[PDB]
From a paper:
During synthesis, the aminopropyl moiety is donated from decarboxylated S-adenosylmethionine to form putrescine, with 5′-deoxy-5′-methylthioadenosine being produced as a byproduct. Spermidine synthase (SpdS; EC 2.5.1.16) is a major type of aminopropyltransferase that converts putrescine into spermidine.
Here, we determined the crystal structure of an apo-form of SpdS from Kluyveromyces lactis (KlSpdS) at 1.9 Å resolution. KlSpdS exists as a dimer in the asymmetric unit, and each monomer in the dimeric KlSpdS is positioned with two-fold symmetry. Each KlSpdS monomer consists of three domains: an N-terminal domain (residues 4–66), a central catalytic core domain (residues 67–250), and a C-terminal domain (residues 251–292). Meanwhile, the catalytic core domain contains seven β-strands that form a Rossmann-like fold from β7 to β13 and seven α-helices. The electrostatic surface representation of KlSpdS revealed a large cavity in the catalytic core domain between the N- and C-terminal domains; the cavity was highly negatively charged, suggesting that positively charged dcSAM bind to putrescine in this active site pocket. While the gate-keeping loop of H. sapiens SpdS (HsSpdS) sterically hindered the entrance of the active site, that of KlSpdS had an open conformation. Although Asp98 and Asp167 had conformations similar to the other structures, conformation of Asp170 was distinct, possibly due to changes caused by ligand binding. Here, we found that the first structure of fungal KlSpdS, which was determined at 1.9 Å resolution, exhibited highly similar to that of HsSpdS, suggesting that KlSpdS is phylogenetically closer to HsSpdS than SpdS from E. coli and could therefore utilize a sequential mechanism rather than a ping-pong mechanism.
Residue numbers in the entry:
A (entry chain B): 4 to 292
B (entry chain A): 1 to 173, 176 to 293
Amino acid sequence: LTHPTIVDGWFREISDTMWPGQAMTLRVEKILHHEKSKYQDVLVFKSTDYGNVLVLDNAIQVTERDEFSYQEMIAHLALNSHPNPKKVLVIGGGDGGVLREIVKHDSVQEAWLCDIDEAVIRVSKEYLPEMAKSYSHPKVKTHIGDGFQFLRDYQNTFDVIITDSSDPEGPAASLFQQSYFELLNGALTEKGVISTQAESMWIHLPIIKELKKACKEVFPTVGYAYTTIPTYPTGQIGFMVCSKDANVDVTKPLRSISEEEEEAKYRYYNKKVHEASFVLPTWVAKELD
Amino acid sequence: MSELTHPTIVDGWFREISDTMWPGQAMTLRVEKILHHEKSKYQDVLVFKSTDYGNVLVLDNAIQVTERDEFSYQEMIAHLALNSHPNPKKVLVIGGGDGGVLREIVKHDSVQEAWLCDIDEAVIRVSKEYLPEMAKSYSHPKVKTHIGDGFQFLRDYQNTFDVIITDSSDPEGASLFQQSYFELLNGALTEKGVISTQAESMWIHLPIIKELKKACKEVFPTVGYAYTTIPTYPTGQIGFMVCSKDANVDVTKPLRSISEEEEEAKYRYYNKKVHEASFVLPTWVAKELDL
C-alpha cells in the first residue's frame, strides 16, 4: 500500500496552521490499512519503534507505545474530580482508550461513547487491541451519531464528560467555544466534570487563554493541565478540566487510591502527577492568570 | 554550489535523527536559511535560521538550542542546582558554550564568580555571533572562561565550586558519566556542593536514567531526577540529575527561592512551584526509579 503522508519509509505529519515550521516523523515498518470512511481518511501503519499508529485525516491520533499518557490524563483528571461518578461519556473516543481508563473506576455504572465514525471503532478493534479491549467490558455503551444531538437528548445525565477530539482552531471554533461548553454543561449532573482536549502551551497559548475565558463563562471551576506525549509535535498537549461545582478544586485530586493500586492500574497518572499537571511554566502561568 | 548545504537539511527541513539514541522518530524544523557551517577540531558546527524557532545551533548533527525555546533547558538545569545550595558563591559550567547557562547563573546575587570550561572555542565564537540573547552572558563581570578539557580543570580546582553544572553537547552522549566522573566532580565541590547534569528523556531511556541514578548515589547522599519540556528536543523533553553532597538537603523541594514577582521578572519557565513539580514523575518512571 501507499499513502501521501509516507515517503521513503517515513511518516510525516505537517500542518502550517497547527504546528507552523515543525513536524513529527516516524519510521514506518509496514502500512497495514488505508480506507476513506464516510467521514475521513483512515490510515494504520506499523511503526518500527512505536507499535501500530492510527492516523486520521493525516494527523496522528495514537501510537500503541505512548497512547497511555493521553488516555490516562484526560480520563482520570476528570474522574477523580467527581465525588462518585456513575454515568460517564466520552465524545470522539473511537479508539477505545479513554473507555479503558473509565472502567477502571468501580463506581462507574455506564461508560458511554459517542462517536460519528464506525470505521474508527472497527479499525481500532483490529489494530489497537490494548485500547479497544474496552469494548468487551459490560459497562460500555456505544452511540454512533452526532455528539451535539446526543447531548440534547441526555440533559442532566452525565457525571463526567470527556471530549477526546482535536480542538478546532479557526476563528469559527474561537467564537463557538462558549456555545460548546454550554452544551456540555446541560448534559452534566449538578457536580459534573468535563475534560476537553486543548492545545500545547508551547505553540498555542493564545488559544488556551481563549478557552480558559470561554470555560469561565460557563463553569465556576476551571483549570488547565497538560501531559507529555513523545510522538506529538512539541511533545505535549493540554486539557481544560472544569466542574459545575464551585466547591471543588480540580487541581488537587478530590479522590485517589493507594500508591500500590496506582502502580497496578496506571502507567502515567497518579495523585501527585494530578497536582503537578496544573503547575505551569512561569510565562504560561502569568499569561493565564 | 554557491549556497550552503548540510546533510541534516533536506528539501528545506532540518531533521533531528539518531538511529541509536531515538530510533524510528525524528523531529523536524523548517529552515529559512543556513547561516554558518564549520568543522572544528572537535565537532561539526551548524547554524541555521529556522522559520519559526529563530536561530538554531546544531553540533555533530544534534540540535543544541533554538532561540525560541532555549530558556527551558537553561533555566531548569541552572536554577534547580543553584537553589539547592544555601549560598553558592563560585559556580562552574562544563560545556556551556552557548552562554545560556551562564546567563541564568549570574541572576543570583550570591554568585561572585561564574566559570565556564569548554573544550571548543568554536562554539563560543559562533554563539556570540548567532545566539546573542544567550552569549550576552560572556560580557558579564562575574563570568570567567577557561578553554580546555574539564577533567584537567576539575583536577586543578578541588574543594572550590559550590555548584557545578554539566551541559555537554550530548548527555554523554563519549558516555563518560561513570562513577569516576561523579567522584571527580565530588572532589571539585565544596562541602555542601551541588551538581546538575543533563540526563536522558524518560520516554526512551529509562534504563540509562536508572543506571545514572545508581552511579550518582554511589557518590552523593542526595540524588534526584527532574525533567523539563523542550518542544524541539527528541520526545519533547529531557531530564537532569540533581545531586548534593549534603545529606540534609532535599533537592526535590527548593532550598532557596525569590518572590513570585521577581520570578515573573527573571524567569520564563522555572519557578519555585515548577522546581517541585519537575521531580514528580509519571507512575511507570517513578516506580522504576525507586526500585
